[PDB]
Design a binder for this molecule. Structure first.
Ligand SMILES: *C(=O)[C@@H](NC(=O)/C(=N\OC)c1csc(N)n1)[C@@H]1N=C(C(=O)O)C(=C)CS1
Length: 245
């Protein structure tokens, strides 16, 4: 309704699913249409990862070299000298979206097929880490796999804590969902971006009064060197909320 108003306003396509937990209402707008997850997968990569380590294991310092650097390393290039420890890598990857840090977390849980096999294992048959479907997923499946990790029971209580934390203190999205949501309202999020003007944010939002909603906004464009505008995430979000309230 309003959603289409913004896809002509920002010349883009919007993927949207919100679900309100306490009550199950839903806001949906192209929820099953594919969009590349781009870096929002870093949230899910870490949900697996905690499945797989004690919180001591996460202290295991990790040594790497300047060859492991790719195109965005914003924390990780500060260190190839010292080294950084897996918790440190969870943090950088999620709060900063460091790509190198993702790369390493991956190579720990045994990479894209291992992660696949692991997402299939919590009910996710859409998400697709390797008319192209390689590396794309849907507003739907992303909210439902994020909820499994951070709100349901796919993690033990104390790991589930650290995820959130990492996602509350994200630095990468205050122009996006965190912008559509009033002062006083927690969001934990992980943001994405790529060419063809993909810009994504997924998130849990908590409104001082009882149960959280969980929300994915996705978008892209036309046209491969397109650039993206953040305020499309923010208004998309203001509608989802009202929509909801
Ligand atoms: C997040 O999505 C991750 N993205 C990338 O490195 C890029 N593409 O990945 C397929 C990328 C950077 S810009 C472009 N054309 N492609 C990191 N995340 C963010 C973010 O805000 O979450 C970035 C702004 C870029 S790097």
């Amino acid at each position: 309704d309003d959603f289409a108003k913004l896809e002509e306003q920002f010349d883009a396509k919007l993927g949207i699913f919100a679900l309100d937990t306490g009550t199950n209402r839903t806001v949906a707008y192209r929820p099953d249409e594919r969009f590349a997850f781009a870096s929002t997968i870093k949230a899910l990569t870490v949900g697996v990862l905690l499945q797989q380590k004690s919180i001591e294991d996460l202290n295991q310092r990790i040594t790497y070299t300047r060859d492991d650097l790719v195109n965005y390393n914003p924390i990780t290039e500060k260190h190839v000298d010292t080294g950084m420890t897996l918790k440190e890598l969870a943090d950088a990857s999620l709060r900063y979206s460091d790509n190198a840090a993702q790369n390493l977390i991956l190579k720990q849980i045994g990479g894209p097929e291992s992660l696949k096999k692991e997402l299939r294992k919590i009910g996710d048959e859409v998400t697709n880490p390797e008319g192209e479907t390689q590396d794309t997923s849907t507003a739907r499946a992303l909210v439902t796999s994020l909820r499994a990790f951070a709100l349901e029971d796919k993690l033990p209580s104390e790991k589930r804590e650290l995820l959130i934390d990492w996602m509350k203190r994200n630095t990468t999205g205050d122009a996006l969902i965190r912008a559509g949501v009033p002062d006083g309202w927690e969001v934990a999020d992980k943001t994405g971006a790529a060419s063809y003007g993909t810009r994504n944010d997924i998130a849990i939002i908590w409104p001082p009064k009882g149960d959280p909603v969980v929300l994915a906004v996705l978008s892209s464009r036309d046209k491969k060197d397109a650039k993206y505008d953040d305020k499309l995430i923010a208004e998309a979000t203001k509608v989802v909320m009202k929509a909801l309230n």
